[PDB]
Amino acid sequence: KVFGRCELAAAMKRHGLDNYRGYSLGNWVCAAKFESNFNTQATNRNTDGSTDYGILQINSRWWCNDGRTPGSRNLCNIPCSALLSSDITASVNCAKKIVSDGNGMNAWVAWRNRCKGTDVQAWIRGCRL
Ligand SMILES: [Cl-]
Ligand SMILES: [Cl-]
Ligand code: NA
Ligand SMILES: [Re]
Ligand SMILES: [Re]
Ligand SMILES: [Re]
Ligand SMILES: [Re]
Ligand SMILES: [Re]
Ligand SMILES: [Re]
Ligand SMILES: [Re]
C-alpha cells in the first residue's frame, strides 16, 4: 500500500508514534517519505547483503528475519515480510524498538540527513489529527 501524507500520519499517530521517545509525529512522517515514499512494499538491498523493508525501511541485519542475511539477528522477532503489509502494525512496533535502543531516530539515515533539525511539523500541516 502507498499511503497518502495525512493518511500515514493518522495511522502512525493511532499506533502510538506521536512523541514516542520524544519524537513528534512529523519526524516519523518525514522519515517515511524519504525512506519508502510512503510505500509499504518498498524494499532495498544494502551493500552488506541485508535488505530494508517497508514504510520505514527496517533492516534485516538486526531487526527482522528474511532467511538470507546470515549472521544477522531478529530483534523484532518478525519475518521481514510482515513489514510490507498494508497494516503498519508490524513496522510501528519494530520502529518503537529501534528508536528506544539509545540512538533515537539516527538509526534512519534519511531522517538523520533530511529531517533532523528541520521544521518536521510541516509534514503534518493540514492533516485533521
Ligand atoms: Cl537470516
Ligand atoms: Cl533521542
Ligand atoms: Na535478520
Ligand atoms: Re483506510
Ligand atoms: Re486508516
Ligand atoms: Re501530535
Ligand atoms: Re534508505
Ligand atoms: Re539501509
Ligand atoms: Re512551520
Ligand atoms: Re486533535
Numbering used by the authors: 1 to 129
Lines from the paper:
The one-year chemical-exposed structure (1Yr-Y) crystallized in the orthorhombic space group P212121 and is refined isotropically due to the data resolution of 1.68 Å. The space-group selection is reminiscent to that previously reported by ourselves indicating the two protein subunits in the unit cell. We see that rhenium coordination occurs again at the His15A residue [Re—Nimidazole bond distance = 2.5 (2) Å, occupancy of 80%] and at His15B [Re—Nimidazole bond distance = 2.6 (2) Å, occupancy of 75%]. Rhenium coordination occurs at Leu129B [Re—O = 2.1 (2) Å; occupancy of 55%]. Two rhenium atoms (occupancy 26 and 27%) occur in the vicinity of Glu7A and Lys1A with Re⋯Re distance of 3.2 (2) Å which is within range of formal interactions as typical Re⋯Re cluster distances are 3.46 and 3.40 Å, while Re⋯Re van der Waals interactions are less than 4.3 Å. Lastly, coordination also occurs at Asp119B [Re–OD2 = 2.3 (2) Å, Re–OD1 = 3.1 (2) Å; occupancy of 62%]. c density to allow the identification of the rhenium atoms, occur at six positions within the protein, namely at Leu129A (occupancy 50%; as specified above); Arg5A (occupancy 45%); Trp63A–Ser100A (occupancy 42%); Gly71A–Trp62A–Arg61A (occupancy 45%); Pro70A (occupancy of 27%); and at Asn103A–Arg112A (occupancy of 13%). c density is available to fully refine the carbonyl ligands and these have been removed from the refinement utilizing the monomer CIF ligand, QEB. In the 1Yr-Y crystal structure, it is remarkable that these clusters form by drawing to them rheniums bound to different amino acids, all except the tri­carbonyl rhenium which remains bound to the histidine.
The X-ray crystal structures presented here are for the protein hen egg-white lysozyme incubated with a rhenium tri­carbonyl tri­bromo compound for periods of one and two years. These reveal a completed, very well resolved, tetra-rhenium cluster after two years and an intermediate state, where the carbonyl ligands to the rhenium cluster are not yet clearly resolved, after one year. We report here the formation of tetranuclear rhenium(I) tri­carbonyl clusters in HEWL protein incubated with the starting synthon fac-[NEt4]2[Re(CO)3(Br)3] over a period of 24 months. A dense tetranuclear rhenium cluster, and its technetium form, offer enhanced contrast in medical imaging.
